[PDB]
Design a protein around this ligand. Sequence first.
Ligand SMILES: [Br-]
Ligand SMILES: [Br-]
Ligand SMILES: [Cl-]
Ligand SMILES: [Cl-]
Ligand SMILES: [Cl-]
Ligand SMILES: [Cl-]
Ligand SMILES: [Cl-]
Length: 603
Amino acid sequence: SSLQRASVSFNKPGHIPFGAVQGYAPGGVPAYSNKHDHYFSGERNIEDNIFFGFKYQCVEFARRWLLVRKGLLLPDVNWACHIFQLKEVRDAATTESFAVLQVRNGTTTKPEADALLVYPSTDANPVGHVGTITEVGDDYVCVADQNYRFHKWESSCAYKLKLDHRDGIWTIIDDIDADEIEIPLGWLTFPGRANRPEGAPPVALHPSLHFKEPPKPYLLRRNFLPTESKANWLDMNNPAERLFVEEFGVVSYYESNHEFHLRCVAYGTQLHAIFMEATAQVIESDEKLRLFAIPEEFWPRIRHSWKYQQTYISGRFDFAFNNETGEVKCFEYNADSASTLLECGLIQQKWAESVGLDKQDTRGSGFAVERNLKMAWANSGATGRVHFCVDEEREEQYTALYCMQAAEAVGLEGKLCILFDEFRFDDNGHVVDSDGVRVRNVWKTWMWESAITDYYAAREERGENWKPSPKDKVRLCDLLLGDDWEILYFEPMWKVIPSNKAILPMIYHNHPEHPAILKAEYELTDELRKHGYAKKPIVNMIYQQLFELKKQDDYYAIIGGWMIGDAFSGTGIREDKSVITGVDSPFAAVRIKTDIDKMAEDE
Ligand SMILES: [Br-]
Ligand SMILES: [Br-]
Ligand SMILES: [Cl-]
Ligand SMILES: [Cl-]
Ligand SMILES: [Cl-]
Ligand SMILES: [Cl-]
Ligand SMILES: [Cl-]
């Protein structure tokens, strides 16, 4: 019991883990959990060179289901909804094309089982959706799919939809969520092909239907000569974009193929899982917590943080990438607070528009950022007012205002706080703001170390019998390390752990397979002496292996990879001919070369 405000996590109640079997469609076709809406793993489902789809999206089910159930291969389709515009599929054995029949919703045709129901594209759901209709009642249809609902099925389908019948017309309506009604376009039948017998084994596919090995990934430094350029290209009204300009006063950017971007989504999301696992191990060990130099006095608190709050908004990986070898290696996870968010999720596209580089065939590397900040916030567990707290530093202010825009977009109320005078103590020692409201949610750039130092400093300046009264000005340590441990902090206190170089030998030991992990040890080893090592200490030592930074046009380049909530949501670059300090280094635009040009990340 004990915990007055609810613990929060991104594992929502109802939902089952990514990849757990939710249930089976008739014929023994399993539906896997995609964790939650709009989650994207970056990982392909391939058995025996048959590319089914992405782990686990809605089309992936459609396609898997069609093979097992009818012996027919659904062709490549970028957006679910485009399925309704298919005229033909293909035969698993002969490859001969095979005529689907398109049957529109809201006509005089009743729907029937073993059809692919297809929802349209909307301003509110841009790729649409595809399910299988497994049964058709008098007044409903049953649907089997992936990536719409996340529960353990209580039957052979995911859900039931209304089937309306008035004046001769049949209309499947999805009004389950009464404030997000959708009407499907219609459904594809496959007239002439019987279901495969139930408990028949799967057909083997003609090898000319094997997945074409994708192109090897590349990230390549390009030079462009803009024909059209815009004098003022940022929106000076928007406060975020203003503080940027007053901070920073034939061109260049990087081009990645779609495969490189997929490789980052997959490596990103997996590294995040790996760091989180590691972070649990540290949290449960007195020894490891002393190693990370967390003072013993803060263990109850950090441990509490870890139990109480399993949500978080941002963290940034630092990668190197080598074009010839294909290798992506991760140096570190700056999960407490990273610069570069506004640049990545806005300024670089804005810029690209200014030099006319947003042609049809490429996209802004951080297109997802905006939409995923909203989803982090919407699912963060924060409710009521959120205080965004920063220093007299513009870089932090535009970082903050950018997450406020996202916060305010999803129903949260926001208040930017520069330093600590917006706050006061009330009659009972609690921290409150200028309108008299008790603090409950705090997003901040202020670092936990800075707080821990201010706490130790504070400890004499007033003493140890001291108890806050309205007389006392609020300090950092009161705003982040006061007696109210149930304030949600964004980036929570446990985020110091995965940010700490001491986690690096632990993630190496737990998962040395991972193509992105670098060998790291607590002690020098003969093998590190051969490969080359860096001796990186902490807040004794850790030793990590070296990776070559390869140059293009003489520039070294480090890649930043954002986690926004649990989404890997984009990449940016900083480059330098000498040393990428990224306090003072030029940021570089990353563009992805790809309705024939749209992706799966949008689902
Ligand atoms: Br609450
Ligand atoms: Br940084
Ligand atoms: Cl897919
Ligand atoms: Cl009605
Ligand atoms: Cl058979
Ligand atoms: Cl403890
Ligand atoms: Cl409130």
